[PDB]
């Protein structure tokens, strides 16, 4: 099957990593054209190629639940389960912003609280403008720091319910994370 999780994958958060996306949205992705045309047989090499061509982020839009290419690529990586350091290479890229945010969202869905904070808090210093597609299909201009703030604070990002992060001060009182040193 084009949408089966690869049979050399982990079980993230106790479940099939594809299940980190809500089932209704998973099915809506599975029946989309972008998933069947542009997201078949993709490896972690070609997810990069599709990622550099992304023009916006967002979840679903319209009266019908139509996934964006961003969400489709997120589900594709959840299926492939690329190694952690591949995702760090995704995030550590500074030229293509949408690749960085795609990697950040995968890290948020996949990584532990320590990994999430350690890898996404450095992205508060990125203020590049970005297109984000609304539920009505319109496009809004957000910033990368706002997207990372939504990742680290909001329950739902790109219409995905995110795995519950442990609050920062709990990890800080456990010495596992030094306080958030800003750029100011």
């Amino acid at each position: 099957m084009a949408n089966r999780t690869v049979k050399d994958a982990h079980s993230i958060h106790g479940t099939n990593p594809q299940y980190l996306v809500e089932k209704i949205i998973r099915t809506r992705i599975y029946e989309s054209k972008y998933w069947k045309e542009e997201c078949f047989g993709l490896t972690a090499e070609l997810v990069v190629d599709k990622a550099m061509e992304l023009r916006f982020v967002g979840g679903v839009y319209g009266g019908n639940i139509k996934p964006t290419p961003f969400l489709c690529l997120t589900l594709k990586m959840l299926q492939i389960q690329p190694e952690k350091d591949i995702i760090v290479e995704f995030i550590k890229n500074e030229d293509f912003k949408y690749v960085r945010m795609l990697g950040a969202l995968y890290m948020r869905l996949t990584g532990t609280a320590i990994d999430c904070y350690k890898y996404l808090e450095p992205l508060y210093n990125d203020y590049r403008k970005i297109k984000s597609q609304n539920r009505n299909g319109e496009f809004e201009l957000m910033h990368v720091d706002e997207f990372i703030d939504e990742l680290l604070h909001s329950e739902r990002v790109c219409d995905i319910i995110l795995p519950r992060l442990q609050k920062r001060y709990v990890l800080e009182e456990a010495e596992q994370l030094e306080p958030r040193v800003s750029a100011l």
Partner: peptide, 10 residues
Amino acid sequence: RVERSTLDQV
């Protein structure tokens, strides 16, 4: 079955 790409490839 999809090829598992490595670090250097990406």
